[model samples]
Target: ATYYYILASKKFLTEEEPLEEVFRERQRHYREQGKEIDFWLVPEPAFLEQPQFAEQKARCPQPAAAIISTNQQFIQWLKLRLEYVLMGQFTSEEVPNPLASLASVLE
Candidate 1:
């Protein structure tokens, strides 16, 4: 069974700040140094009750991120991507959903 990485920070992140921008700027700093990062930002509660992540609820939902890697390159790139997404500087054009192309067919 695979386990999900749930980031539970010691303190909660402020809702007033632009969380995405904060993450993106940090990603840029890593790029300047030629490093990379990866992961996903699942919104709160959706997976809270998921069997794989039941223990995460005890901690406050602080501003946090996760990283998953199998290879050095993939993990590096993922890190970079995570940073970009956090700062709203990323892209999703690479993975076209199978359903998007068929939208016209249903109409």
Candidate 2:
């Protein structure tokens, strides 16, 4: 078990202000704590094509973005804050892509 994902429209993520900065700020917090990074923003998450994620894929429109994270709390918090997102958690065993989305984006 490794990933907790939130799927949303590309516009909400790509064209938004607070979205990008929030992730950056959290990563910095982990850096300061001497901890590892736990989240990622996948512009095109392959899991969207996987069978297990089909439901979420269908609800969110195309040009989707996946905020894949190992931190469930962070993922959950995002779902709470954002109104237009599809939330689900899956294991790497189910759809492995470890660190593939790590260098996902840079703000």
Candidate 3:
């Protein structure tokens, strides 16, 4: 199975920094290492401002979800989950209900 990394931008990390340029630099670094940067999940600013997302924001900081997995269906599920997350419609405390099942199916 492939590994994934999810990095959120912290306020300190983005303060006075051009975010696009930051990501571009990171992409370059990844390329230099022969790492193919794939999908990205971006949430709205307001989405992170909500209390429901407080914990998520704390965990992710600047709002980035870097999903790494070889399972296409798992990725699709994550994409759908991201939609729910952005809409503030998903308030479940559980982060691994279906995830465990999905992992079992794929692995």
1-107, model 3: which lDDT tens digit per residue? 23332324534224532245545775798789998765333323343455655776676644342333333554555445433221123322423221121111221
lDDT, each prediction: 0.36, 0.78, 0.41
Which 10 successive residues of model 2 have the least lDDT summed?
A: 98-107
Which RMSD values do the candidates have, in order? Answer: 11.6, 3.0, 13.4
Could you give candidate 1's per-residue lDDT for residues 1-107 as a string of tens digits?
22223233323223332346645775787689887744333434233344444455444353333332223453444435433322112112322221121112221
Provide the lowest-lDDT 10-residue window in model 3.
98-107
TM-scores for all candidates: the values are: 0.32, 0.84, 0.29
Highest lDDT: which candidate?
2
Candidate 1 wrongly placed segments (more than 4 Å): 1-14, 44-47, 55-107
Residue 68 accuracy (lDDT) in model 1: 25
Please report the candidate that would top TM-score against the real structure: 2
TM-score of 3: 0.29
**Pairs with backbone N, CA or C atoms under 3 Å apart (clashes), candidate 1:** 20-86, 24-87, 37-78, 37-79, 37-80, 38-78, 38-79
lDDT of 2 at 40: 83
Candidate 2 TM-score over all chains jointly: 0.84
